A paper describes a structure:
PPR proteins are RNA-binding proteins found predominantly in mitochondria and chloroplasts. To bypass these limitations, we previously used consensus design to engineer artificial PPR domains (cPPRs) that are highly soluble and, via an appropriate choice of amino acids at position 5 and 35, can be designed to bind RNA in a predictable, sequence-specific manner. In this study we have discovered that cPPRs bind not only RNA but also ssDNA in a modular and programmable manner, analogous to their RNA-binding capability.
Next, we sought to obtain structural information on the two cPPR proteins specifically designed to bind to telomeric ssDNA sequences, to understand further the cPPR scaffold’s ability to bind both ssDNA and RNA. Although these proteins are highly similar in their primary sequences, only cPPR-Telo1 gave reproducible and diffracting crystals. We solved the structure of cPPR-Telo1 and cPPR-Telo1 bound to its ssDNA target using single-wavelength anomalous dispersion at 2.1 and 2.0 Å resolution, respectively (with sample electron densities in Supplementary Fig. 8). Our structures provide the first pair of structures where an identical PPR protein compacts upon binding a nucleic acid in the canonical, sequence-specific mode, providing an opportunity to understand how the conformation of the protein changes upon ligand binding. cPPR-Telo1 wraps around the ssDNA upon binding, inducing a massive compaction of the superhelical structure and decreasing the length of the protein from 104 to 64 Å. Overall, the rearrangement is based on the a helices on the concave side of the protein moving into closer proximity as bonds are formed to the DNA with a concomitant separation of the b helices on the convex side. To allow the separation, an extensive hydrogen bond network between an arginine at position 16 and a glutamic acid at position 19 from one PPR repeat and a glutamic acid at position 18 from the preceding repeat in the apo protein rearranges at three out of nine possible positions leading to a more open arrangement when bound to DNA.
Residue numbers in the entry: 18 to 367
The structure:
């Protein structure tokens, strides 16, 4: 039960009656307090048991360190960990894992790695949490090659990686343009029965899109849909941006229609790529319809949107409409630039 207040009341009573509490009494209470996040009181009882000649054990220390770890009190958890080792108390996997997770989360990777080396030397065997924690930590720091080396090591030790491990690595590799390796980890992940998620697919599609390998990006987009994975605003913007750069305007407009059909909300980036694409193609009636639609949908145009339409309208001799959008642009607080002015001056001077 979570009846801690009564447990504490009974503890006060036994001490008044002259009954001496033992390691069991203290461990239960400290464990109860640690689980309730009442760590100042858990630490008072730990000090009290020590003064009373009661000797703490692995459970006492692990409960306190777990509790202080969950409270963001990392420096105090590391101090108790040094203390437990001085008293000859042997730390276990839980102790090492809670500390490495805390250190990892704080970006204290040199110390997280020293504790990981130490647990191996003391015969403590790391598990999926130990490795995942370190991989995530190293990943966030840009320390990708070190993360990859621990991934190789974890597999040699028969520790099975999960979605988190793979997704952290694929993300880091895709960001660095190391696509062939990202794709290799993706193939391995599926082969081992690990199920990719929206994060796995979006990273690879972003990566492939930014490298202009769009047929592959589209193949993976089709695959995620067949696998029951749901594309989001990022998946769609990446593909639209990618196909837009490739001059594949009609396919980018078809995905834009698809995304709205699936209730995915397009942003300023989606609308802009399309408006520029259409503008560049002289498809001004359609660029203007999308411009009207983004306003009805709450999407606020910026200087690129206005410039594209002005440059577009200008090139088509549609000068009075270009001038009207120029006025609107200034009414809406968007600041014109060299391009906006030079486009209008050309058309007017012509």
């Amino acid at each position: 039960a979570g009846r801690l207040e009564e447990a504490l009341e009974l503890f006060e009573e036994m001490k008044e009656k002259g009954i001496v509490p033992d390691v069991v009494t203290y461990n239960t209470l400290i464990s109860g307090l640690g689980k309730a996040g009442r760590l100042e009181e858990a630490l008072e009882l730990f000090e009290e048991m020590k003064e009373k000649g009661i000797v703490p054990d692995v459970v006492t220390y692990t409960t306190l360190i777990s509790g202080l770890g969950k409270a963001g009190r990392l420096e105090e958890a590391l101090e108790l960990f040094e203390e437990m080792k001085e008293k000859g108390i042997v730390p276990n996997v839980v102790t090492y894992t809670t500390l490495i997770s805390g250190l990892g989360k704080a970006g204290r990777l040199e110390e997280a790695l020293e504790l990981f080396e130490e647990m191996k030397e003391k015969g403590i065997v790391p598990d999926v949490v130990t490795y995942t924690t370190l991989i995530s930590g190293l990943g966030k720091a840009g320390r990708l090659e070190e993360a990859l080396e621990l991934f190789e090591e974890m597999k040699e030790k028969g520790i099975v990686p999960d979605v988190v491990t793979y997704t952290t690595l694929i993300s880091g590799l895709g960001k660095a343009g190391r696509l062939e390796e990202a794709l290799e980890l993706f193939e391995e992940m599926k082969e081992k029965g690990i199920v990719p998620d929206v994060v796995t697919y979006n990273t690879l599609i972003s990566g492939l899109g930014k490298a202009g390998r769009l047929e592959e990006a589209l193949e993976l987009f089709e695959e995620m849909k067949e696998k029951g994975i749901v594309p989001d605003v990022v998946t769609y913007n990446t593909l639209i941006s990618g196909l837009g750069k490739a001059g594949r305007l009609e396919e980018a407009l078809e995905l834009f229609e698809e995304m709205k059909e699936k209730g995915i909300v397009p942003d300023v980036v989606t609308y802009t790529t399309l408006i520029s694409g259409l503008g560049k193609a002289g498809r001004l009636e359609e660029a203007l319809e999308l411009f009207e639609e983004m306003k009805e949908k709450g999407i606020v145009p910026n200087v690129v949107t206005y410039t594209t339409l002005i440059s577009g309208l200008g090139k088509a001799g549609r000068l009075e409409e270009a001038l009207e959008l120029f006025e609107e642009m200034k009414e809406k607080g968007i600041v014109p630039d060299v391009v906006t002015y030079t486009t209008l001056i050309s058309g007017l001077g012509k």
